[PDB]
Amino acid sequence: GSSGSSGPELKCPVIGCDGQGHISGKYTSHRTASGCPLAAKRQKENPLNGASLSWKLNKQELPHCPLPGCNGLGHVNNVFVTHRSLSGCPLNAQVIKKGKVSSGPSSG
Ligand SMILES: [Zn+2]
Ligand SMILES: [Zn+2]
Structure with missing residues (x-):
């Protein structure tokens, strides 16, 4: 490694989002809305997936x-x-x- 490399790049313009992941699935990251999986999850309604700590929870509401x-x-x-x-x-x-x-x- 004679030298490294640095420089800013696009980023998920969708506020609140983390930028990681992809609306496609193959990619585990994104820097644009078109590829923003979160921006799509909202417009659409697919509760299919979803993991929640449901076990030994007295106060859950x-x-x-x-x-x-x-x-x-x-x-x-x-x-x-x-x-x-x-x-x-x-x-x-x-x-x-x-x-x-x-x-x-x-x-x-
Ligand atoms: Zn995003
Ligand atoms: Zn109140």
């Missing part, structure tokens, strides 16, 4: 919170870490406020 940003995790009483309702939603309680002078109707 998702919360029931209306708030989009809220991950149904937490509690107003500041005691637990879960909540499947508003009254319990800690992020919904603080928000509560009658008389919010500042009001921005504009929606972009």
Whole structure:
């Protein structure tokens, strides 16, 4: 090895993606959307494949919170870490406020 080599190259423009793998399968990597397997997995619905740690799991379920940003995790009483309702939603309680002078109707 007299010398090495370096240089930037294309990359998966699809945010959130890892860039690894290929919508074809043969290749275990990609740097474009056309070859992005993740971008295809979304548009399509093939739950065929899927591995999840299902064994000896007592607490296995998702919360029931209306708030989009809220991950149904937490509690107003500041005691637990879960909540499947508003009254319990800690992020919904603080928000509560009658008389919010500042009001921005504009929606972009
Ligand atoms: Zn990708
Ligand atoms: Zn919540």
